[PDB]
Amino acid sequence: RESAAQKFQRQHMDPDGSSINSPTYCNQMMKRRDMTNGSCKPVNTFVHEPLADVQAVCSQENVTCKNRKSNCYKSSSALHITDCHLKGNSKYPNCDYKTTQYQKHIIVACEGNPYVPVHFDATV
Amino acid sequence: MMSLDIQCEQLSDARWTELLPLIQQYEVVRLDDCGLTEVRCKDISSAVQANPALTELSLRTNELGDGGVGLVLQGLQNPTCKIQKLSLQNCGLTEAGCGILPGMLRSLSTLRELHLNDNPMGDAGLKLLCEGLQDPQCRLEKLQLEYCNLTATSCEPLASVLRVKADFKELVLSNNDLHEPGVRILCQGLKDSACQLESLKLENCGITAANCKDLCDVVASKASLQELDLSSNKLGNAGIAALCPGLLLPSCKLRTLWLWECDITAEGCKDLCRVLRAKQSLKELSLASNELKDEGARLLCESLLEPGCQLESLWIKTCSLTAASCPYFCSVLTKSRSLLELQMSSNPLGDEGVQELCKALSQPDTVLRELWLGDCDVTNSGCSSLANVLLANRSLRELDLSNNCMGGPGVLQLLESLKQPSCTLQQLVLYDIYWTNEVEEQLRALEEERPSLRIIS
């Protein structure tokens, strides 16, 4: 049992990590963060910023979630991110990922008390 | 028989020293993604040197570097070493540390499986490797050199190896830019080889349609070929056409055919359907990331319904399929008694397409066991139809609906069906679907009612 806020950190938070030198970054991280258990998570984003920085996003621009929920927030500044995309050669339990890096604004859904990220919505 | 298997752990000096006596005694030692470094390779070398029972050693995904890798191979040169399977995948091996390979491969006459994937040895490192592989005492059954920074100049040395070996069963050179001429040299080496090759993987190797007559020749020459992976190569329809005659030979017993992202369209899919209808041996086929379109899908479905087709798994993720193709899959899900897995993610099916599929699956006599419908633009309005399937279907064990447009309301409709203990589904996959804490509570309540039910997110 984990809270939504804990699940978000496990799946999307890697403050000190870096993928720019490691093409196998996603392969390691998706496996380590328990996102290849039972099924290969098709796509996932890791954020390389301090946890407190990502949490501060909930106090920034309010926008609409992709599913039309209204509790989504866009980061004021572009953040360092690594995208992981499952390759079409994958067949569970073999999960091979393509690793890409960007600096882009993120959109997260915030919930509960304290008001923290519980869902990664998009990068813009 | 003694086996140790560590996956994804931070081995502290404490936890580490514990294992040394084991590494000196055990038959099987796997230390994968364990944060090992060169600081630990002398322990490994010493341990292994004194281990006459060791047959498998895997150290994949550890930052050993050239020094670390060097130390490990050094310890594997005792006349006592009995090793059969060795993996140094993703261990930071560069050309700089390959000078030891020729010596190691000469002495390790028991070695059958060698994994060097994800090491940037390059062509210079590969040549040193082949100097070892060339040694008469080096008789591998399996060689994996995926993503090792190799180019066309590595093909001649590799081909020269294949010509004189007879024990090769599996060869993977995927994700190396061998180029058209390099691939021709490799094929020639395979043709001239007496090896009864069982598996050949050359994903993303710069293979073109021009290479496909040679690959056809390769297939024809290896009646033992069970798996062929030519994914992520620009083969095109013409390439497939040049390939199919070999697949159609009576001696061909191909089991798995992987053609992910090969610039194939409808007519190329047509060529392959000829193979589906004639080769009962073909059990797994991937055409993911090819623009087959609805016409392509129509052809597959008609072939799947032919008596000659016994396909078990079909991978067609990201194939530009729309709701218009779904009536044809319905006939398949209803009639085909061989298809157990159907991956249709990342196709713009919509609620319409998925509702159609639900019509066929809402019968209790289907055989489909796994269905992926992720990123198919499924909304809340398609979930009630899926809910009905979960009630009425008696074969579906896994359903993937990740990355769709649905939300809590949709998900709640699915959970309601799963409340029934008679439901056949064992695993529901819902990655990147956002629902509120309220739905989660209903979700975790169900999980505790039915512990055998796996809901993945």
Collapsing DSSP states into helix, strand and coil, what is residue B27? coil
CA distance B200 to B174: 9
The shares of helix, strand and coil residues in chain A, as percent rounded to the nearest 5, are 20, 35, 45
CA distance B136 to A14: 48
Sequence-separated (6 or more) residues with CB below 8 Å from residue A42: A85, A86, B345, B346, B374, B375, B402, B403, B431, B432
**Domain extents in chain A:** 1-124
Residue A123: beta bridge partners?
Answer: A106
B406:A112 CB<8 A:
no
B434:A69 CB<8 A:
yes
The helix or strand, by DSSP H or E, that contains position A47, with its residue range, turns out to be strand A43-47
Query: What fold is seen in the domain A1-124?
Result: P-30 Protein (3.10.130)
Number of Cβ atoms within 10 Å of the Cβ of B162: 23
Peptide bond into B307 cis (omega under 30): no
Contact A77/A105 with Cβ under 8 angstroms?
yes
Q: Does B456 touch chain A (CB under 8 A)?
A: yes
Nearest to B429 among A23, A39, A91 (CB): A39
CA distance B132 to B105: 5
Method underlying the structure: X-ray
Nearest to B436 among A28, A111, A121 (CB): A111
A39:B317 CB<8 A:
no
**CATH number of the domain that residue B344 is part of:** 3.80.10.10
Chain A residue with minimum CA distance to B314:
A91
Total domains in chain B come to 1
Residue A105 annotated among the catalytic residues of the structure: no
Q: Does B90 touch chain A (CB under 8 A)?
A: yes
Q: Does B258 touch chain A (CB under 8 A)?
A: yes
CA distance B263 to B272: 14
Q: Side-chain half-sphere of B158: how many Cα atoms within 13 Å? A: 27
Catalytic residue, candidates A12, A48, A85, A105: A12
Contact A15/A50 with Cβ under 8 angstroms?
yes
Query: A39 vs chain B: nearest CA distance in angstroms?
Result: 8
Chain B residue with minimum CA distance to A21:
B92
The stretches of B88-174 forming alpha helices (DSSP H) are: 101-107, 122-133, 155-164
Q: Provide the residue count of chain A.
A: 124
Sheet holding A97-104, edge to edge: A43-47, A79-86, A97-104
CA distance A67 to B397: 27
CA distance A49 to B401: 30
